[PDB]
Amino acid sequence: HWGYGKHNGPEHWHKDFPIAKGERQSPVDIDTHTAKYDPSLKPLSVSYDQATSLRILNNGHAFNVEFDDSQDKAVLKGGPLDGTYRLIQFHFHWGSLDGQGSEHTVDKKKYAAELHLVHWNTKYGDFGKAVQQPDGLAVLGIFLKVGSAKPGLQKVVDVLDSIKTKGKSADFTNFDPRGLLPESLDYWTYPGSLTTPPLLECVTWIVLKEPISVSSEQVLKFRKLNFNGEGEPEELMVDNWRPAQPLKNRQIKASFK
Ligand SMILES: NS(=O)(=O)c1c(F)c(F)cc(F)c1F
Numbered sequence: 001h002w003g004y005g006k007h008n009g010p011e012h013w014h015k016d017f018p019i020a021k022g023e024r025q026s027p028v029d030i031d032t033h034t035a036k037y038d039p040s041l042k043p044l045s046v047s048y049d050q051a052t053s054l055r056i057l058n059n060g061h062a063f064n065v066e067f068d069d070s071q072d073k074a075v076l077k078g079g080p081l082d083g084t085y086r087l088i089q090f091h092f093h094w095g096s097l098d099g100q101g102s103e104h105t106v107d108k109k110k111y112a113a114e115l116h117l118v119h120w121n122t123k124y125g126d127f128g129k130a131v132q133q134p135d136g137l138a139v140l141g142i143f144l145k146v147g148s149a150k151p152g153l154q155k156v157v158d159v160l161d162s163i164k165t166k167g168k169s170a171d172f173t174n175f176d177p178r179g180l181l182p183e184s185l186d187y188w189t190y191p192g193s194l195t196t197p198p199l200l201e202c203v204t205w206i207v208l209k210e211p212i213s214v215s216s217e218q219v220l221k222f223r224k225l226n227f228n229g230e231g232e233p234e235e236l237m238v239d240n241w242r243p244a245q246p247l248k249n250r251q252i253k254a255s256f257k
């Protein structure tokens, strides 16, 4: 199956997922000078106060923190979005070293990691139907730089020892994703895709301009996870990012003047 290594990584994915060479693939480089303020954007609303986290899972590519999406408990609205998008999971992408790890880049600069909060459009009833639609998903992306610790990340870091290998999961109730946000909600937005196979072109990307700071110790614990399953030779879970893809016939819009 697909992965991030030399023999099954991003440069190979197109052989099983030909949309990898499609017209609205993600991530992209965000050219901050070409991005244009868009007055048609409405205020962005991140409404996570009633979020219900359930479980954390090592899926062999990253770890997902999963939420109850059976009701509008945690939703994203506004900005470029038409209607209500419900939070289903978050995960990260990160590097082997602090100088790489993000999927999106900003004027070609790579951050140490990138957080993705994944939401599906409730008009389509389930995530599976949403990923058959051009406006099925909204992903809120947040860059991570290394500096001071992020207190709201520490509960995630401390459970990782219990999900070291592919297929392991643990209870992860009562986690508040609001503690992962930066102060500002200034953002860039563009139409794109999943950054992982099957690379479906369903996503409205909303990428926050302000990075969060995490400590070196926090990201070092991400890098102790394993891509492999229990009892197999250790392959550290690092560099689980897709590089920037061609912008093609797209424009990146900014929420800020
Ligand atoms: N296209 S892919 O990245 O999904 C892939 C490969 F490139 C491969 F060489 C072997 C696989 F099993 C596989 F699934």
Ligand SMILES: NS(=O)(=O)c1c(F)c(F)cc(F)c1F
Pocket (backbone or CB within 6 Å): 116, 118, 137, 139, 193, 194, 195, 196
């Ligand atoms: N990176 S991503 O935010 O595009 C993403 C998704 F949106 C998704 F629904 C499932 C994934 F596995 C995934 F990595």
Ligand SMILES: OC[C@H]1O[C@@H](O)[C@H](O)[C@@H](O)[C@@H]1O
Pocket (backbone or CB within 6 Å): 036, 251
């Ligand atoms: O034709 C002019 C229009 O060109 C488009 O490509 C831009 O997105 C608009 O902001 C602009 O008003």
Ligand SMILES: OC[C@H]1O[C@H](O)[C@H](O)[C@@H](O)[C@@H]1O
Pocket (backbone or CB within 6 Å): 155, 159, 171, 172, 173, 174, 175, 176
């Ligand atoms: O909030 C996520 C998790 O944080 C800590 O691990 C708590 O010990 C655990 O009870 C909780 O599920």
Ligand SMILES: [Zn+2]
Pocket (backbone or CB within 6 Å): 091, 092, 093, 116, 195
């Ligand atoms: Zn992602």
